[PDB]
Structure formats: structure tokens, C-alpha cells
Amino acid sequence: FNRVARGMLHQDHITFAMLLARIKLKGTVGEPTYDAEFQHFLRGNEIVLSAGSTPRIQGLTVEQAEAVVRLSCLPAFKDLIAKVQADEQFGIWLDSSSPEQTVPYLWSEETPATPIGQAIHRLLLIQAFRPDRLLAMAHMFVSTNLGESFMSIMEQPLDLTHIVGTEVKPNTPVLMCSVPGYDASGHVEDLAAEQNTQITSIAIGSAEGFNQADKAINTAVKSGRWVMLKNVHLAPGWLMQLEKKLHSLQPHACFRLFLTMEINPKVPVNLLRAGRIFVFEPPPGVKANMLRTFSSIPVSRICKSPNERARLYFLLAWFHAIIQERLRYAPLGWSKKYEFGESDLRSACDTVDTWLDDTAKGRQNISPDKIPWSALKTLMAQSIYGGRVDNEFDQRLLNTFLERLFTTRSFDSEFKLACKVDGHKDIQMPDGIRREEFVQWVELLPDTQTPSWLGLPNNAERVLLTTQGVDMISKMLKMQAWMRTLHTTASNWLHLIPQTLSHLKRTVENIKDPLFRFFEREVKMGAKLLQDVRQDLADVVQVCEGKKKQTNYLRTLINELVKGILPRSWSHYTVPAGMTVIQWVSDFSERIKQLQNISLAAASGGAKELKNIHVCLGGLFVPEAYITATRQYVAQANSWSLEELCLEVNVTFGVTGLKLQGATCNNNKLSLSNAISTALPLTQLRWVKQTNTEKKASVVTLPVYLNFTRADLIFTVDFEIATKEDPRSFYERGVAVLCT
Amino acid sequence: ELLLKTFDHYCEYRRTPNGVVLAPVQLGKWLVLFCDEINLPDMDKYGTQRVISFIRQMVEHGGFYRTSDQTWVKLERIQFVGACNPPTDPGRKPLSHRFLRHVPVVYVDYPGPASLTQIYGTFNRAMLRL
Amino acid sequence: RWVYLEGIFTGSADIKHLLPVETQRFQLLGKIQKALGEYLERERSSFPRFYFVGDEDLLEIIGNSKNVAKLQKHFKKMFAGVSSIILNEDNSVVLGISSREGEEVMFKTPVSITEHPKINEWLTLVEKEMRVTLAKLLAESVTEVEIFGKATSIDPNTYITWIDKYQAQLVVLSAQIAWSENVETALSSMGGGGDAAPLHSVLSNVEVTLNVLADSVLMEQPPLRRRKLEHLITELVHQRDVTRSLIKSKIDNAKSFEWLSQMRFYFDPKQTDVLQQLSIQMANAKFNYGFEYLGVQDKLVQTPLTDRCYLTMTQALEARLGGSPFGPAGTGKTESVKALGHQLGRFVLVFNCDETFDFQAMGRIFVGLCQVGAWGCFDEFNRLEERMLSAVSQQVQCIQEALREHSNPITCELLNKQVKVSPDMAIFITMNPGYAGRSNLPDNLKKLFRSLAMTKPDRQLIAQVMLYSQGFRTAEVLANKIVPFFKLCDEQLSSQSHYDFGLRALKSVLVSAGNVKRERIQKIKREIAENLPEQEILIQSVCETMVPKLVAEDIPLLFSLLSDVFPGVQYHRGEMTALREELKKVCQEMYLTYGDGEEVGGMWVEKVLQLYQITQINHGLMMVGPSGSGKSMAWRVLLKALERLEGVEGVAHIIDPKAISKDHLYGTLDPNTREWTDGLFTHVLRKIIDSVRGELQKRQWIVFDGDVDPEWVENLNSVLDDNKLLTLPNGERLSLPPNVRIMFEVQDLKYATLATVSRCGMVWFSEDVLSTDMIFNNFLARLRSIPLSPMLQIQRDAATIMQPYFTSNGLVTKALEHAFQLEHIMDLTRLRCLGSLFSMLHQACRNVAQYNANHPDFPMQIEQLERYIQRYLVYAILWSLSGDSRLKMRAELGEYIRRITTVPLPTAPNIPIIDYEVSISGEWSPWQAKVPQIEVETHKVA
């Protein structure tokens, strides 16, 4: 397990542990094989049930009811339906933070099963009820099978020197596959320096790196010299040649050959077969990340000059880990998947060292309030970590974290690294002076890392955990005419898609109105798209009836439509990436229906009925055009200019279809809530004269995004907050507004 | 390069009196470069056929730029006729509306039933006379 | 090898005494060649800037020791701002250096050519004396500006005397030094002061000198002094803002980061002449000033982003890393990098990186940077191949290793050669993430550079400052109106491929606004006087730059936005009648239609005038419009009109980019011989620069008539931006002469990145611009002349006959629109059908000529001619608008023609018209009478 895990991704380790647990279970003495239970676990969704679903005491959702009725097929599980509705603490267990620790006894067994039997029973119950905790329960099952601390080696930082010197033969190359944003050249350079062995580092390319690499390899086999070839994934043919040459050299002992390369499918399979593979990723969890950072930093560099340096380095490592593994929750954490890596941490270390040495020349025990907090915060927010930050919201999040951590109050005793992780349990600042104190404090961190540590909501991992569990089950399971259909689908699509919508009448008085101009352009673009898609679908129907011939364009359209890929011609408005054709068609139908309603409203009134209508910004080609049109209409109504205008939104022009991501509004103020989304019914967009006055403390700026993928900012709303709330908490929680 | 080789082989004269001009050996005779399947040439990664751009340049501007001396060569007694297929034919790609301006298009369809009957009827009556 | 030595051993007289033993032993091969190369590299090592010059240029330079005037061209590319050197009357003693803008830096200590005859040594001494002279003049200027520092109510006359006394870079340096010293002294005086606020005196001094400059720029000023003033306001407004920020934040001591973060200068002429008097310092980053004559260049409005960029670049240089600004195009990357490289006063070379830069080229460039110590900004670095990015990661790691070795005359491994490395080195790579034609960077290289996100420049402050500097008294309100106007125009207008509303757009608008203001001042003076309406000047600039690229459905939107942002004022097009009469004359000479306003051919005249405007504003132009919109004629007629209106000839080279391989377009560099052969564009540019035939006195107009894709136009990013410079893999840098315009006649910019769209002023030639009646009139005018005298008369009276059928709403137009309503195998293009029709009518005239020749007696008469022509016209319409369609489409067009015509037609009711030809006598004869039922021979069948 350890040797294979050294060269495989962190997502797939749990599956390998599951398979090894199965192998150990089949190798036991007398305990039952539990083949039926594993069969139901691997494929439980495959069982088809038409109308047998029946909710009990309204305690199970549709998915939960389907799961429990599917799982009732197992003979020990015949009484699930009656037993769950006869239990009262089951409701408390369902919404428990960690139900994996305690699973109520529900399965009926004639004889007391072995503890592994109880473990697999609990695994089935967890899969049926709490798919989010499926990873935790699988971890518990692996623990009960292979013993505790079985896959605890993966948490420890990898020891390069011992593995290279013992587990690697000279002929076999050492392969360091690196995910994007990570490079293994630095670690092995440090290894070579530590061993005091001269090493040849060469980057592959330019047709001269090949000759240099060949010469270095020829010299190194008779001398024990180490050799590095960096970014060797751009010359696969030369890499075939390298494998063929390396198969037979019988080189000198202590000789090694390192091949730095990225993870792409264009690397040869035979080289991967013939070499030891090492994969470098962001370590999982804050604990392992702290451990890796502390191992990376030399001991001599810490505990040199003032004793506050160790606490500064611990704060730096905590900040680095927090921002590093917030990247996992990209839609809700950092809006973009940045590349906070090892160079960022090295630059942070260098700046901290230089500024601490400048602020304290020789003298130790510098006062906490004399450390250059402002210098470090600005350098970390504007030059090292903020350099890769593009949008202003991510920049303000980085400023929030830097101001929360890098401060004099961090040297107190009651300073909290995390505001709240359980609502009452707060991560306390370790009262350490020397490095080993902070290191051991890291090592006693509990194994219950929730996203609430990060500032993100506690329920920000449900979807990701369930997806990982489904992927784990799919991996484990993998381990063990179109013409008539297109005819039917095209007919159904043409049926559901409405007919062409009418334009808007161009009059002398309506042409001047900005709202009318915007709506005319909208309906014109919608009509063009509707006509194009309707004639394309009609052409598909005619061809699938066989009467019409085949065109290159028609061939391409059919080929990309049978696969569920949205045609590129139909992609005229901004859409979330990578949906199926059916979802796009439903969205288009809703958009065209709204456009027809707009046309009817304009027909009822040329201008008087164009202001008092409600528009869902989710379905609209260019929402910023709508915002600009409302601004222009308000500016033209009065004598006010466009610039002397600011937007104030009152949640009840009328705007519908908006949803808040984790905020409940009472009247117009905001209060933080644990709900994933909160609907905004009939928001009003009011433009008022700009007063050039600084906003109040309770006022915060929430971005408004078009869809779930926060990748297209529409406009920003300044919301006020209710009593006893902190705008910093709003910013760190990633509250936003979604049109879709 | 195909057209360049064709001109080098048949249009030897690359003479440059008061300007570089390209003409065939056989004086007093024009030259028709019958380019067949003109729309088969693949377009670049950015949707642009190179030889089509060359033809448009050497037809509209009436010449090209030779790579040997970067000098303008003007066509003399040279003309182009192409033969192609409908765009809906698989493997075919439409030409740029910029090239079409200098070349009129004529559509030749398959001979109709009566047309085939009469055309090959004459052939059969000629053959069976043996 | 042998041919090389044979060619190069028979040159000038003294050129052959350069290690002449090979010359005598020639008139073996490897030894001679390597000895010559060793001599070249020795001379290059003697004077580091020789690693920027070519080997042939260097050999000619050494051969031309006696003649110094012929050597006054390589100084432009050896140095940064040096373009000429001032010698004595006897051509023996150099007295100083002259920039290309006519600015002189007289050497404090002249050096004589006779007193050091070798080229390299006297060049080294003139470089050193230039640095020494700049240092001494900076010291004198700082001493002078001390007086303004310790005085209030300063005298404008002496202040302007100081400004035009010294060079521009020295003036800005003195201003910054004085401000830094004053603020440092004030902060030291405050110390732990509870209420002492003497820095308000510094703020008041900045205020009063800024007011003096504002008054001085409102009136007529000399050119160089005008630019010095513009720079000085740009710096002093930043100083004012920084001082206000310091006052608001209430900084007590000079060691606070709120003062340490901002760049501050430290001057002390006490130390020796090692040229270390200046100590430019960012946050804990100590920088020396590598005194070199930059000349007079533009200064950016140090904005909040331009500061963050300064901070990050200085930090990267402190860590001895490189800087990698990244973000959207036109966000101030290559100009901020350059502006910071000139703030420290160091030689900065910008290279436009493309995939043709091989490993040896990068190594040679890096060797030159090592020897000279000059900075390097590699524009569009990601445009290299990924393999080559990985390959040059090694060189970056070697060069940075030499800088890290300096920390412990340093040599680094660069192309199996050990080269001296100076600490002033810098390597910068600007890149555009997520853009077409760009390759991703390896993590190995990406960790060798420090990157920042230059995504959104602060255009409001950029505008307000550039204006305030121009002389607009309400610059604040103007910027507050124009920047939101741009941001609302970006949203309200329809998305188009040629639409650009970024910083490059705002910049072109504000420069045009300044020029318009100057012209209006001149016009008013031809009849102080500062009651101008500024809003209408801005409207004129916007309408002269933004309008020429709007589509026909966007102009109302833009004008409504302008009327809403600027309520109360409007601009009317300049008459330009002195050009319009010339346009009318030349259009008449070219059989093209001319009009004014709502006449026929009026929109086309508006577009050619807009093209003239863009020619005046931009140096790169781009014509976007459907094929057959009059783009080619617009610039042809404009060139022919300007060569008469102004008297300067205009020569246009038309190059098709995609026709030939880009290797032939730009050039090739064989990796073995390392010889550069000019491509097509490079050859033309070199011919223009080397005005042997007076090419610099002609209005050269290079036009790229083809398709724009992000592969070749990206090689022109450096020629179409402020750099006006062409950078080659050979290292050669070709400046764009001011009399050259790079044009691109395209039909669409769909396959183009925003980078090229941002430059090259857009002119949108809509299809409605060239009306069909104009095409008809062109044909008829060409028919009434250009004999295909007797033949000319046959064409004339034929045109007289066909005149009624070519009405704007005549038969041909209706037939054409109906044909566009039908279906064709290929998409119907108007100019294709019209070309076929015109060709067939020309053939009709040839048929008349043939018939007239065939019958010398009884010549073909007018009634017969009119019958024949009026039938051949219908025949031609049918065979031009439906020669590409299937049979029943031809029948449909024939039926439409029959029901909407008055020309006599065949009377048979069933057979379609197309089955009829037109006999030379003028009768609609059937075609089924020319199909003999022949009988093939019994052999050779099929």
C-alpha cells in the first residue's frame, strides 16, 4: 500500500485501501465473506423501482426513500422501513455533524456479527442515509480491517533520500509526476545539496538538451553522478529511445536518474512501467500542509534571532495552508483556481526574514507590537500572494485573511486562529516559543477538519463529499438505432420550443427610449436565434425522415447533437460551461417564453408598460445592457447625468429570479445563515443621486453572478447587515448572489 | 509550391524589362491553368486556405511576390479556371467570398433522363453498327 | 567557410588590417574562420554594446575608422537615447551626444579620436563621459532646485529657465530628489511629534509649483519645453497625491512603511565619481541609477496599479528573480516595465517574442544583456514553443545563479561561453493568459519569475492626469464623464469582432483631444483666450476615433450615450473641402462615383475621410468590412488625393500575408551558418529605412490585404504599439519611420486576439457604403472609355442603350434582389454576379465589333444594335444571377424577369427563356436548333 500510494493520486488512495481491505477479508479464517452486502454496496442504484417509494414520518427525502427501499433488498434489511419510522433519535442522527462515529443499530441479525460485520453494516447504512459521510465511514471500515494508522504514512511528508538510496535500483529512473502548479525540481535539488552530491539538471527541449542529456548520462553511469531531466514530457520519441537505452546500462551504484514531468496522457506507458512513479500534490487537509511547510523550512532558519520569529513562521504557515486548501472549494472559496505554490511560500519566508531582521538588529525578544505588521501584510497582499489574484473580491478576501492573522493580537493567549469550528469550539493560538512547541501543536490537531475551520460554511462540503463517494464507488466497480431516437428527440424539441416571436413596433417616440431600444435588441437577437435553431431542427427532422441529402454542416450538427454537445452555432449568449443539449434547450425555451412576455408587455404599452415589469436576469442575453438601460432611463427621466447615479436595491424597476448564497434578509438587512441558497423574490433596482459619502460599517458589497459558476460578474449590490454580525465574516464566507 | 513548379516548368520566361513579368515560351498563345478540385486544399488552423489566398492575390492584384528577390511578378498570358463540387459534399469546404468576386461560377448538373437517353443512344447506335 | 572568407577578404583598405595574416595567407579554413570570429568576439568583449551590433556592421565600423559620419547610424541601436554624436570641425574630437529629438548633452570633458584611435576604447570613454556628464548635470540641477525647495511664491520666469536649462530626465530626477529630501526632512523633524505638521509646507510647495506649471502649459510653449512640462506635471501630481495620503494617514517617522513603500530618492554628491550619488529605493530595495542618456520619452501617470507593479518588480529584483506581468491586452505591461526601467535610468530593450526565436538567439540576447547590463522585456514570451520555454528555463536558472553568485566579474554558463555578468541585469516577460496562439509555461520556468495581475488599469486617474497636463481646466469633470462613458459603451453597444474599448482606445482619444485643442488655439489666434468648450473638444476627439469603427446599427447608440453623458453640446463634421475637391477630381479620373452627404457615393466619401482621420491619428490602420465594400478603392483614392493635395508622393506596397509562409514574410535564420535572410515585410522596411532612393520623403503605405490570424500580426505588436520598433530573432531592431503606415484590409476579425484589435485604428466599411448604382455607374463610365476609336464608339452607343436598364431601382437591381432570394450552390456575392454580367456585356460589344467587321458594307445600325443589346442584357442577367443554380431556379428567375420587364421576349409559353440565345441580328433564337443529332463513327465511340 505504501509503495503504490507514493505514486498515485490522493483521490484514489481510499479506493486502493478498500480493495486491500477486501483482499484481507477474503483471506480471513471463519468470518463470513459478506458477498451479498458488498454486492449491494457496489451496485445499489442499479436496482430498478418504479412506484414503490413511500416516505415515512416525513423523515426521508425522495433520494433517501429510494435509497432505503433499494437497500431493503438485502435480507438483513427487510425491516428498515418500519424501524426508521419507529425511532425518534434517528432524526437527530440524520442531521448530526459526524454520524459516522455513532450509527444506531437498525439491522436485524440472528446471531451477533463480528465487528467487521457491524462495520460493513454501518457502511451500508451510511451509504443509504448520509452519502456525504461515506468517505469517513469507508475510512473507519479500512481502520477496522487493516488496523488503525494503516494509511497514516500518506500524511507524513515523503522521505526522498531513504527511498532513493534503498528502494530504487540504479537502472530504474525516478519519475516525479507533478500536477499543474507544482514542481519537484526544488525538492530533489535540496536532496542533492543535502547529500553533497553533484547533480546535472537539464531541461528537455531545443534539440540540444537531448545531446547534453545523453552526454551527462554517459558520464554519470561510470561515476555515480546524479542526473535530472526536467519537463520530460515534450519528447515522447526521445523518451522511448531513453527507455530503450536505460534498459541495459548496468550503471555504477549510488547512481540515480530523475525525470521531472507533468501528468499528461502523452507520456509513454513503458517508461511508467519501468520507473518508480512519485506524484506531488497539495497535501490533504490543513494538518498535513502545516507539517509539509514546517519540514520544508530548515530548522536553522527558525529559532534564529528573536523568539518571535517562530510564531511569525507558524502564522505564515497557517495562512498558507488556509488559502492553499480553500482552493478545493473553488466555487465558494477562491473564485478562481489560483496557483499558490512553493515559490509563494519561499518568497513569504524571505520577506518575513528580511523585515524581521531589519526591525530587530541583533537584539532578541522584540516586542510583539514592534514587528512590522503593516509591511508584512502589504507585501503578502500586493506582491507575493496578491500578484496572482485577478479580481478585486479575491484580493479583498486575501486582505481579510492577512489582517485577521498578521496582527499584534495574535501574540495574546486567547487569540483564535478560527472564529468558530463547532459553534463553541474555537482553534486556539498555541502558546509556544520554540519551533517544537508549534510542531507538536500541529501534530495534536484533531482529525475532524471541517470547512468551518476555513471561514467557509460548515455545509460547504456536502456536494463535494458525495461526489467523491460516488466516484469511489464507480472506481471500485470498474475495478471488479440512433437515427430513430434522434428523430423522436428532434420532434419533441420542436414541440416544446415555441414558434417565432413577434418584434416590437418602431415608432418615432419609442425609438428614443433606452428601455425600448434594449428590449428591441433583445427580442431581435432572440428571434434570430429562434429562427436559426428552428430551421436547423426542422432540417434534422427532414433528414431523419430520409428525404433530404447530407450536408457538411448537417453532418457536423448531427454528429455533435447525438453526443449531447451543444452546437457552437447555438452558443450565442453566455452559458455555464459544459452542459447537455437538453438543459440548454430548456433554458432556451424559458428565455423565449420570457421574451414573448416582454413583447406582449411592450405591445400593451409602448413606454408606460416597459418600466413596471419584472425581468429575470437569469434568462437574458446581456444583463449588463439591462442595468445600463435602467440607469440611462432614470438619468433621462430627470436631468441627472449618468455618472451622478448610484444603485440601491430593496428586496421585496422589478427584478426576479435572484438567489442569495448563504444570507437571509429580514426587511433589507442581512443575517448569516447555513442555508445553501436563499431566494430573492422581486428585488427592486432603485437609482439615486450619488452623495459622495462613505458607506456605513454594516454596508457590504455582494457580487451578483449569472450562474452557479462564479465567472461572470454582472453588478454589485451594497447590502446592509443586521445586528451583531461582522462584515469580515460575510467576506470570508464567500457570500454572493446568483441569477441562475 | 505546386503552382510555382508548374510555372517554372512551362513558363520559363521570368523576364524583367521595366518590371518582372511571367510569360510562357510559346509566344502569341495564352495559358489556361486547369485547377481541378480547387476547394479540397485544407484551410489553416484559423480557417484560411493558402493556395486560395495566393490565387486571389495573383488574380486581383494581377501578380505575386517571388521569394527569391521579394520582387513583384506580373502575370502575362495566364488565366485560371477551376473545377469543384457543392459545399455540402463531404470533404468539401466553401471558398472565401473575397475570392469568389473575381471568378464567376457555373453549375453543371448530372445529365437528365432524356438527356442521358439521347447522349448514350447516339453512342449505342454507333457501336451496334459493327 | 571558404566562400565567406573569399567574400570578406576583398573589402576596404584598413578593414583588411584587422588581423591581416589570414588575408595574406588566403590571397586552414577552420583556423582562419575561428581566428576571425575570435577577433570579432574580442572586440565585442572590449565594448559590451558591440554584442548588440551585427558582425558585418562591426567589421564595417572598424574599417570606417577615418570616416565617423557614416558611423552616426549605429548609435540609435547601440544606446537608448543617443542618436547622434557632436564632433569638432576637423572630425577629430567628439564634443557631445544628440538625441533624435534634437536635444544635446555636451560632454563636461571632451575626448579626442586622435587621443585614443581605437574604436572600442574611445567608444568606452565616450560612454563613461556621458554617464559622468549626466551625473554632474544632475548634481547642478539638484543644487538649483534646492532654491525652489526652500522658497514660496516661486518665480515662474526663473522656474522655466531651470526647466529648459537641463535635459528632461534630469529635470524629472531633480524634482523627485527634491521632493524625497523635503518629505524625509519633514518626517525627521516631526519624529514623535504630537501636533507638528511641517509637511503641509511641502504640500503647499507642491501645490504652488503645480499651479505655476498649469499656468505655464496654458500658453504657447516650445516643443521640447512642452514635453518637459507635461512630464513634470505628471510627476508632481503623483507627488501631491502621495503627500496627501501621508497627511491623511498621519505618518510620524520616516521608517514607517506608508512612506517606505513609495519610491523615494537619495542624493549625495560627496562620494567619488563611481556614479553612485543616487540611491533610488523602493520598500527595502536599494537601487543605483545607471546613468545613461534616455533622451526624451513619455512618462506614465503613476497610477495605483502602476505602483503595485513598481513594488512587485522591485521586490523581484531584490530577490534577483524576474518580473512576469500578466493579464488582458492594453493594460500597461510593456510600458510600465519600460517606465520603471527608465525610472532607474537603465538601458531597456524590448523584444517581441515569437516561435522563431531559437535557443542560440535567446542565448546571444542574454549574452548581450550580460555584457551591457541592460534590462530586457520579452513581450509575448508565451508565444514561443513550450519546448523552447523549457529550454530557456535553463538559461534563466543560469543567469539568476550568476546574480546569486554575486551575493556570495561573475561568469554564467550561456552557450558554452563564460560571460561577465553585471548586477544591473533584469529579465522581464510580459504574457497574455488564455489567448489564442499562446503556449502555456512550464512550472519550472513559472517558478523562476515573479508575476502580478495587471488586469484593470485605473483609467480614471490615467485620463484626469493626461488631460490636466494638456491644459484642460476641468480635467477632473472631463475624466469623470469620459471613463464611465467608455465603460457604458462597452456594455450598451453590440459585441463585434473589431470593437475595442480599452486603455489603448482612451489613450488615442485623449491624444487626439490634445491635438484638437492645440489646433483650436491656433485657429482662434489666427483671428489667454481660454474660455473654450472642453466638452465639445472631447466629443470631437471621440467622434473622430470611435465613430469610424461603429456598425450602422451602433451609431445611434453611441450618439445617444454621448448626448446623455454630455447634455447640451454637439459636434459637426469638419468640412475638409480642400481635400474633398481633390477627392472629387481624382475620383473623376478613376471612373469612381463621388458625392456629399446624402448624395450617391456620400457614405463612401465619409468613410475615406474617416480613413484620413485615422491615418493622421494612428500609425497602424485596419479596414474591416464585407468583401466588395470599397475598402481597396478608399485607400487608393486617398493616396492619390494626398499626393496632390500635399505634394508628397505616396507609394504603397501590397503584401498578402497568408499567401506566402511567414518565414518568407519576416525572415529566416539557419541554425548552422547563423545567417539572416530578410523576408518580405523586413525587406520593404529596410528599403524604407535606408532611403537610398529618397524613400523617407515619400508617403510609404504598406498594406496587408489578406486574413488576420494571431500568428503573423503578433510579430507586429511591437511595430503597431508605442515602441514603433520591429524586433527580429537576429537581435536587429528596426524602427518604424514616421512616414510609414501599416495597414490591414480584412473582411472580418473573428480569428484575431484583442491585442491586435486594440491597436490599428478600425475603419468599418459596411456593405451599404458601396451602393449598387455606384458599381453600375463605374461600369458605364469604364465602358464609355477604355477601348477594349471605332471599337470605343461601339462601346459608347451600347452604353447609351443600356443606360435605362441600370437605374438604381431598374431591371438589374430587381433581378439581383430576386436572385438573392433564390438558392445557389455557392453563397451569392453581389460583386461576383456583377463581374460576370459586365464581362458578358463586354463580350456583347466584341460580338457587335465582330459583326461590323464582317460586313464592311451596310454597317450594323442603331435599331438593330439596340434590339441586340437589349436582348443580350436579359440573356446576361439570366446567365449571371442563375448560372450557379439548379434548373428550376433558373426557370424561376426567368419567370420573374418576364413579369418585371419590357424587353421583347420569346413568345413560347412552356420553354423557359434560358433555352434561347440571342442572334447577332437581334432575334431570340432557340438553342435546340444548334444541337445537331450527329452520328458518331462506328469506331472511337465513347
Ligand SMILES: Nc1ncnc2c1ncn2[C@@H]1O[C@H](COP(=O)(O)OP(=O)(O)OP(=O)(O)O)[C@@H](O)[C@H]1O
Ligand atoms: N466610389 C465608387 N464608385 C464606383 N465604383 C466603386 C466605388 N468604390 C468602389 N467601387 C467598385 O466596387 C468594386 C469593389 O471595390 P473594392 O475592390 O475596393 O472592394 P473591397 O471591399 O476592397 O473588395 P475586397 O475585399 O474583395 O478586396 C469595384 O468594382 C470598384 O470599382
Ligand SMILES: Nc1ncnc2c1ncn2[C@@H]1O[C@H](COP(=O)(O)OP(=O)(O)O)[C@@H](O)[C@H]1O
Ligand atoms: N499609467 C498610464 N498613463 C498613461 N498611459 C498609460 C498608462 N499605462 C498605460 N498607458 C498606455 O496604455 C497603452 C498600453 O500599452 P502596453 O503597455 O504596451 O500594453 P500591454 O499591457 O498589452 O503590454 C499605451 O498606449 C500606454 O502608453
Ligand code: VO4
Ligand atoms: O501584451 V501586448 O504589448 O503584445 O498588447
